[PDB]
Amino acid sequence: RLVSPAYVRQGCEARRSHEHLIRLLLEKGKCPENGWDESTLELFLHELAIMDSNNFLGNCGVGEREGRVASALVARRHYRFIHGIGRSGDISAVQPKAAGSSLLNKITNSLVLDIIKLAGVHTVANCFVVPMATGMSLTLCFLTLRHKRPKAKYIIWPRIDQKSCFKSMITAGFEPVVIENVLEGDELRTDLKAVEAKVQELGPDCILCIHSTTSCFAPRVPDRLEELAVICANYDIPHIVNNAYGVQSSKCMHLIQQGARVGRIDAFVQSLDKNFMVPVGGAIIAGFNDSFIQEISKMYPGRASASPSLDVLITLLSLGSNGYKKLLKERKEMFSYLSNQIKKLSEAYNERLLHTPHNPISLAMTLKTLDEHRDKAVTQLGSMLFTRQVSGARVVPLGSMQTVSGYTFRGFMSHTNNYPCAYLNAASAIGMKMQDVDLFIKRLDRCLKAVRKERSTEDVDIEEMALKLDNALL
Amino acid sequence: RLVSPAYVRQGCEARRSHEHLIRLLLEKGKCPENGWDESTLELFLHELAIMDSNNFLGNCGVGEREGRVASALVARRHYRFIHGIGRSGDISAVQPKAAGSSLLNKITNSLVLDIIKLAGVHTVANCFVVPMATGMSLTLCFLTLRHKRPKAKYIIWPRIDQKSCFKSMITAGFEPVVIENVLEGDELRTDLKAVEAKVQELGPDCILCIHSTTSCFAPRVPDRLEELAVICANYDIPHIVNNAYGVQSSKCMHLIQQGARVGRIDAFVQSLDKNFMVPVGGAIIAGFNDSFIQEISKMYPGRASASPSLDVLITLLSLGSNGYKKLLKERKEMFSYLSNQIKKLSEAYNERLLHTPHNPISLAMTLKTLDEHRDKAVTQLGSMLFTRQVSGARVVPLGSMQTVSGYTFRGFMSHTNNYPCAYLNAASAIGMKMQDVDLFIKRLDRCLKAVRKERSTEDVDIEEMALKLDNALL
Amino acid sequence: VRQGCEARRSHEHLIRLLLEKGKCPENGWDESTLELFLHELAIMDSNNFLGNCGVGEREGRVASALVARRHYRFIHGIGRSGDISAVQPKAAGSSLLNKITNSLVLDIIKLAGVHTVANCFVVPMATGMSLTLCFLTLRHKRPKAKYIIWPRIDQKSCFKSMITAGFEPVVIENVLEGDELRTDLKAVEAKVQELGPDCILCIHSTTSCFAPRVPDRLEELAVICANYDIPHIVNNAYGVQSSKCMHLIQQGARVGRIDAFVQSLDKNFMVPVGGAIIAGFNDSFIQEISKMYPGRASASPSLDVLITLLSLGSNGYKKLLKERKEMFSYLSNQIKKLSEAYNERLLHTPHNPISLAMTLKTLDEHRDKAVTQLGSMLFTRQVSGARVVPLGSMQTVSGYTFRGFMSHTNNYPCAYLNAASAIGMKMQDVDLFIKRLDRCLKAVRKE
Amino acid sequence: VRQGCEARRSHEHLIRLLLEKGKCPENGWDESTLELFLHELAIMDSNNFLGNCGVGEREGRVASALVARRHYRFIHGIGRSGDISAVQPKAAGSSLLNKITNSLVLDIIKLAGVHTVANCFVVPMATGMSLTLCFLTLRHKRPKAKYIIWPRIDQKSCFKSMITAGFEPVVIENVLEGDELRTDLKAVEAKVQELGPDCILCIHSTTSCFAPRVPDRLEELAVICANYDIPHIVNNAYGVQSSKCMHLIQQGARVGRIDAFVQSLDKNFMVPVGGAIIAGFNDSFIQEISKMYPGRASASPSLDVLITLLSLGSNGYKKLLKERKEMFSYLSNQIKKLSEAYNERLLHTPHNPISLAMTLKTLDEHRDKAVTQLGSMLFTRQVSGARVVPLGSMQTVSGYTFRGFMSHTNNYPCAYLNAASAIGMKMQDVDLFIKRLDRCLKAVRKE
RNA sequence: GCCCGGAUGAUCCUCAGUGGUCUGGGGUGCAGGAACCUGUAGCUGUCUAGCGACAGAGUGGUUCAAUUCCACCUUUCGGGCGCC
Ligand SMILES: *Cc1c(COP(=O)(O)O)cnc(C)c1O
Ligand SMILES: *Cc1c(COP(=O)(O)O)cnc(C)c1O
Ligand SMILES: *Cc1c(COP(=O)(O)O)cnc(C)c1O
Ligand SMILES: *Cc1c(COP(=O)(O)O)cnc(C)c1O
């Protein structure tokens, strides 16, 4: 029954090794260098969860929001964190009914701030995780700016053909002013002259902010943030940066750091899933003025989900800063490999890799040898890649017209009205493996052969199943 | 190695019993009457998850959002659903990269619509789950209305002292017009005269909407929705109903149904955690015009978390419509029991249960025998209940001034400037057990004794630990 | 913050109370307390140490994360290679888990009706192999013994356990007393005198059994064993759930000799098949059985019952025992009603508190094969546990031929159907069984 | 929609290929395929049927949801009460699980070096009790046998397995050949002739062992057994991970007689302690051992290794075997370097492919108790698996007194330290061990 | 249990018929002018101090038009399958 050496022999001795990793986390708020063992991580989460009042043993609840859970499957999959984050008046305020969830939220934001520094923006002052994706999080930035600039109606926006970040300004109730890009070689870049010309035409007081973008599909490249930040500093206009998946790119993060160094960056927003390999649904709002970032936080009404914060807390504690650095290194290596592989394949089909050296993530291969008008070969290629279980291979044909929330885009998906050619997108994002590139190259090869010929074990099953899906669509 | 009767002997025979429960769900989109076994539920989720492209065996990904997951703990706790819900242009659109998640989202919304009908609003036309809490979801309603009424500046709002729903109109960029309530007996009720007078004073075209509330703390009661809906129909003003935790109240839901029957209700919003016992973070936007509800959905920019939808899908499939009906029945029974218990206890301390028959969820017990000015006894009671692990027991002292987003409230937390007395809140919400009431009554008894005396095993450990927490705060 | 750190104290009190007294909690633990306890135990094992390095052949390495998590990172099993009950220095948490589990199990055995039990231990083998371990222990104490005297019960595991241990079973036929089959005490004592006590390894009796057989006459057998100095081993496979079976074991130990009694973990505690409990009244003999086990053993059955008893509590287990009795009365009455409608009757077996039997005399197996059919149809309608017993079934088990197999005698008067009220049975179980049995008898009567 | 339904076909192909050939997949399954497979198997068991009602005593009821989920709802165990290998009609999914697991295990045994193996089965007992089951089976074939001839190895489980089965071990001392302790073939054959083949139950040899002992001379023993018609039982506890041990078993069966060889599941497949594999070359004899097991048994060890082999694949297991060899060379060289710095040496034991030994001659146990200290300090520094062997240690196991215990002989020349490269060992393990051993020897030398 | 095929649900009480905003026959009670003639009829939820009010007719679909036609569900009948 007993065999009891007081509490336990090693019950606190080797347990001390776990507590000291936890104590170092709470004291300095930094990512562990090497990842925690699963046992340490789950011991930490279990001890946090029992701090929440809904998990108290002697608790009784007479309110309308007591964190009750009907399904045990639901309660266990969330590690018994039910109360979310924040209070009804402040999403950043400690919740007296959920001290464990509040500590979870504070530690997660501290870990994320640490990662943003090592990723490239060392002068970041403040950040917080918000359980909305990047589009809605950009909207929250604009909603906050409205009260600071009540006469403003326009958001000046260098064009990028992505529906979420475009709609974010309309959802916030402002009028986007689409600044077309300038073609420099193969690259589409910021028209700094047109941006400043529009500021003078409309008047700075009528401008809510300038909305720039770093991460993007080639042949677009990250915006000229340093020059845009200087324009924003000179005319006293807020600068909001869409950095959706730029955390994984030291080049993108350094553009942000330099923009804040020489000019004005009020906030930059990044997706959680794209930069940390977690489910879709969360984002980080970061900036350099602590007071302003807290203003955006206080703009949020009501409590919020703790699930995205828990996901990234688990991820960073398991990976460590070394594990994340390793993922960033391999992403750079896989970009070179993917670039070289596309160079080799495009040569064999009389295509080429578009020359986009300023885009460190996305690549583009021309599709000039395909006739979309007659054979619809460009659209056929995208469908054949899809049925062959290639995902993320974005096909951009010429002359696509698209209306988004009443605004009509010419040459939609190409970020400009008349790009020289149609092309295919591919990218080296965090977590990509060599198998992804090799299978993509192999399957793109077969698709290019089949479309050019049509104008004139499990591998064959994926091919046989693709032929059935191809014929069903036809 | 084999012993193989083709595939299996019963491998499809008793499996058929599982498939037929699943086929009935997908065909009619209704809640099962009796809850599913856990085995059926998890088989369903596993088969949905393998439909998502990130879980394909022969998949390769070359994009920036491929649903990659670094941590196995994260992937398993979400049943391998990574891609979220929706597309970057439409949160309601099927995601070709996540056919399983898209089916999950559609079935969840169908189940939730079914529950809203059986809960009382049988004429509901459309609804969707949004992974934001009720405050942010109300903001999304106002953001959608802005484009339909671009000259509107004001939201007419019968006062309720809750920071989230108040801030939701300011976060959306509108000016709330606070309509004070009328005291009728002990109850605070809608001042229909002042609402119509403010409509005429400001002009209907300047009114974005009327923002009413059903579920609320006593002594406030649900707004007079039928009369407000008639005012809204006559002046052509949209009507938005805050039904945060009203789904659990057949009285609240019937007010909504009658309001739509005789007048105009454009949308009503309810919390997921408060009505379905799931983690905080999600809500339902429902209405009677299908086209308008889709407009709110399309206002959302970008993809969204699937975690709240998964939580309520698991919950409703496990509970069934019978299980949910049982929770609603027990909530009514526990309201009577809690009411009778407070009647008995308040008598022994020369207090009374406030007469609020029109509030079917929240109750209030007077605290007239406590002196807040001299002894601060009302604040002391709330703290003593907290240290004794009573949660949800809301103490409302007199004369509290509070500023929320620049607007100053007199008598804050009482929903009126000068309520006759201080009081204590308690409620019978879904999932409450008799132990909650008995422990609340027992601990409130000890607290009342201690505060009145101060002016003149685990039970004792909760008391001994409360005395230590009480002295530390002092 | 200060309330949350004081909230861990609430869990610590429950854990401390368990380590100090080793009794089941009265009310079951919350899952949060249980999993907290298990995680703290598992990190005491050396394979889960953060700075551990392993240069041996048994380091507790786990290749699959799915395997490690589902066992709460308990990898080293129980015991040492020289003693299954010894503390494993490389697995202090697993050793603590094994000691607590044995304590909780002893607590339940007393609660269930054998208050005078002295010792017991969980063994990760089922009841058959656990009876074998008992016989293997008795061999070294009685090296001239060759026979095991065994009142007949038609169950292959307990019968084979004697042959596996290397002894010759001596089958004692039962006596028909009314409808019941009971111990033939005269035939037992006659075989003791014929073969000689020194040649008898033990008397192997059985409590829990299928009707119309009833628990053996343990008191009279315990006196025979005491008079002749012959060990007594009781097969109590699923008798823990029956206060009548347990009190019968308690009485036999009071008036006579009972060396050990064995019970299945899955049949009495609703856990997966695989474990058993060896219990006795001589602490030293039970220890001798434990020390006869060679090498380490799986900790999975111990962990299953530990989780179950901590989640149920003694009140939760008491409730299941009370409901088993009420379900038995309900099942009995419903069989009386149904048997009346088909010109059958419920066999009068008041000495069996778990299993019942209903006559199948009106069904013709000789001409229509109707009795064999009924059990087949009962399966396809998904009635599990219903057991049809035809007449004159011959069956060979390890070379021994049984006549009238499944009936525990050579010529029982009639064929019959078995049904039982075991722990965890619901009113749905009986109502479904009655409905499907009615439909099954209608179709057989038509043809 | 059409691509997702075709996506289940990809998983179905892997599952279909497993059921059709019963071999390990070359590359490991994804967790999604594995858990899909397990869930489909579990719903085949009757306890998981949606319309099931239970009126029996063994219905597979589970009180705790934590217990049910952690076992993937496999509750009924393996086998029937009359045959552990028979298909359980109430648990078709569990029976299918057991058959697949035995097939995968047979595939690995061939892959590991015994290509001529005919049959094998997983038994949810550890290696000690599994050797006991072998001896218990041999008793009925050789009812006059009393002795088991056993080349000495100082391990309590395999030694006790002979006594548990009820036989007298005949300890054959080993021969010092250089630094190695090897089989004394002349003494073995002399005991066969002295005691008489008819009185010998079997010869019980051992492959995997601690240095400086080496695997037994299986070929010469297999010929002795064939000439005298004596069964041969091989203790291969952790020899599956060694192509040298497995090939030695293969060669012995080719030139002589080997009736069965037994191996631990945890030591060879990195799963929790609790299971073993009994394998042989006569399909009928292995079946006889299986049928000697009485009653049902736990399915937990089978499920653990099934998950592990499906997740690893044969390529994954091959990789672990290759890395064990490379880790052995690395550990050997690092011990050579460290022993040189302390005026010690690595004992030359080239016939042992798993375990190594380093001399501790410069440490004084008689005056300073330094040898006993080193093992103590090695533990507190969290070095597990390191094994110090002093001189002249006396130890009694089940009544038999060993002199020079832990050393496998009565007077080995010196004390020494044991270290091994077992499957799953990392370069961190060796580097940490060398560093901590260096610090441990520095402190002992100071005092 | 599953598969197949009839009917079944709350005005394939009752037996029938009917795509036409339902009809025929037998039967019961309540109400008046043995049985005859006439009228009449039940249930569930919600909101009410109550009168009463608001809905629902297994869930959906087709159609100008569903008691009627189609699919599925509930109940029930019949057939098939049966070493567990
Ligand atoms: C719960 C509730 C809300 C919503 O608050 P959130 O934290 O945003 O979910 C709004 N108003 C009232 C009256 C509420 O009870
Ligand atoms: C991912 C991304 C966004 C954000 O889209 P959400 O679905 O809201 O997360 C915005 N702009 C770009 C360029 C992106 O890549
Ligand atoms: C591991 C091993 C055994 C196995 O003993 P158990 O604890 O019963 O598994 C037996 N002999 C030797 C030499 C071993 O290494
Ligand atoms: C259950 C039971 C056994 C146990 O046999 P195992 O399958 O080994 O657990 C033995 N005898 C009887 C009468 C039983 O009911």
Residue with structure tokens 């017209």?
A401
Q: Is A311 on the interface with B (CB under 8 A)?
A: yes
Strands A407-409 and B423-427: unpaired
* Contact residues, chain C, for D311 at CB < 8 Å: 63-64, 66
CA of A126 to the centre of ligand 2 (A): 22
* Contact residues, chain D, for C47 at CB < 8 Å: 384
Residue with structure tokens 């220890």?
C287
Contact call for A40 and C31, based on CB within 8 A: no
Pick out residues whose CB falls under 7 Å from strand E: B 13-14, 16-17, 20, 24, 27-28, 30, 120, 122, 250-251, 254, 257-258, 261, 357-358, 360; C 372-373, 375-382, 384, 443, 446; D 50-51, 89-90
Which residues precede a break in chain A, with C-to-N distance above 2.5 Å? 456
Residue D273 CA distance to nucleotide E4 C1' (Å): 52
Phi, psi of D355 (to 5 degrees): -105, 145
- Chains touching D (3+ CB pairs < 8 Å): A, B, C
- Residues 6 or more apart whose CB falls under 8 angstroms from that of D211 comprise D347, D349, D352, D355, D356, D357, D418
- Considering only the beta carbons, identify the residue of C39, C40, C99 that sits closest to A3: C99
Rg of chain A on CA atoms, in Å: 25
Name the DSSP letter for residue B443: H
C54 HSE (CA, 13 A, CB side): 20
Buried b (16+ CB within 10 A) or exposed e, B211-242: bbbbbbbbbbbbbbbbbbbbbbeebebbbbbb
**CA-CA distances (angstroms) from residue A339 to A221, A275, A352, A362, D178?**
16, 21, 11, 10, 61
- Residues 6 or more apart whose CB falls under 8 angstroms from that of B305 comprise A131, A133, A279, A280, A281, A282, A305, A307, A308, B84, B85, B131, B281
Phi, psi of A361 (to 5 degrees): -125, -50
Peptide bond into C25 cis (omega under 30): no
* Contact residues, chain D, for B47 at CB < 8 Å: 8, 36
Answer whether D298 contacts ligand 3 (Cβ < 6 A): no
- The residues in B 396-435 lying below 8 A from C, measured between CB atoms, are none
Q: What is the spatial distance between Cα C63 and Cα D312, in angstroms, rounded to a whole number? A: 8
This structure's resolution (angstroms)?
2.3
Contact B116/B124 with Cβ under 8 angstroms? yes
Contact call for B469 and C6, based on CB within 8 A: yes
In angstroms, what separates the C-alpha of C207 from chain D's closest C-alpha? 13
Residue D229: both structure tokens together? 């018609």
- Burial class of residue C78, CB neighbours in 10 A (0-12, 13-18, 19+): buried
| DSSP letters for A87-140 | -SS-TTS--TTBHHHHHHHHHHHHHHHHHHHHHT-TT--EEEEESS-HHHHHHH
| DSSP letters for C103-160 | HHHHHHHHHHT-TT--EEEEESS-HHHHHHHHHHHHHHH-TT--EEEEE----HHHHH
For residue C335, give the 3-state DSSP assignment: helix
Closest C1' nucleotide to C375's CA: E84
| Residue with CA at minimum distance from ligand 1 atom 1 | B244
Name the DSSP letter for residue A295: H
Strands A154-158 and A207-213: parallel
Name the DSSP letter for residue A214: S
Q: What is the spatial distance between Cα D392 and Cα D405, in angstroms, rounded to a whole number? A: 7
Contact call for B50 and D95, based on CB within 8 A: no
* Contact residues, chain A, for B50 at CB < 8 Å: none
- Residues 6 or more apart whose CB falls under 8 angstroms from that of D77 comprise C126, C266, C272, C273, C274, D88, D91, D94, D296, D297, D298, D299
Q: What is the spatial distance between Cα D405 and Cα D184, in angstroms, rounded to a whole number? A: 18
Closest C1' nucleotide to D50's CA: E1
CA of D161 to the centre of ligand 3 (A): 10
Residue with structure tokens 């000690």?
D128
Separate counts of helices (H) and strands (E) for chain D: 14, 16
Strand E nucleotides within 7 Å of a protein CB:
1-3, 45-49, 54-56, 59-60, 72-73, 79, 81-84
Q: What is the spatial distance between Cα D301 and Cα D123, in angstroms, rounded to a whole number? A: 8
Residue with structure tokens 């077969």?
A446
Contact call for D13 and A461, based on CB within 8 A: yes
Task: Name C119's bridge partners.
Answer: C280
For residue C41, give the 3-state DSSP assignment: helix
CA of A78 to the centre of ligand 1 (A): 22
For residue D389, give the 3-state DSSP assignment: strand
Residue among A129, A139, A162, A166 whose CB has most ligand 2 atoms within 8 A, to mutate:
A162
A317 HSE (CA, 13 A, CB side): 30
Could you give the domains of chain B? Answer: 102-315 (3.40.640.10), 325-473 (3.90.1150.10)
- Burial class of residue A250, CB neighbours in 10 A (0-12, 13-18, 19+): middle
Query: CA end-to-end span of chain D, whole Å?
Result: 75
Residue with structure tokens 């390095």?
C53
Residue C164: both structure tokens together? 């596996």
| DSSP letters for A177-203 | EEE--EEETTEEE--HHHHHHHHHHH-
A470 HSE (CA, 13 A, CB side): 20
Separate counts of helices (H) and strands (E) for chain B: 15, 16
- Whether C257 has a binding-site annotation, put simply, is no
CA of C259 to the centre of ligand 4 (A): 19
Report the 3 state secondary structure along A54-97.
HHCCCCEECCCCCCCCCCHHHHHHCCCCCCCECCCCCCCCCCCC
Contact C124/C275 with Cβ under 8 angstroms? yes
- Residues 6 or more apart whose CB falls under 8 angstroms from that of A77 comprise B77, B78, B79
Report the 3 state secondary structure along B386-424.
HHCCEECCEEECCCCCEEECCEEECCCCCCCCCCCCCEE
Q: Dihedral of the CA atoms A254, A256, A257, A263 (nearest 10)?
A: 140
User: Looking at chain C, which residue has its C-alpha nearest residue D137?
Assistant: C164
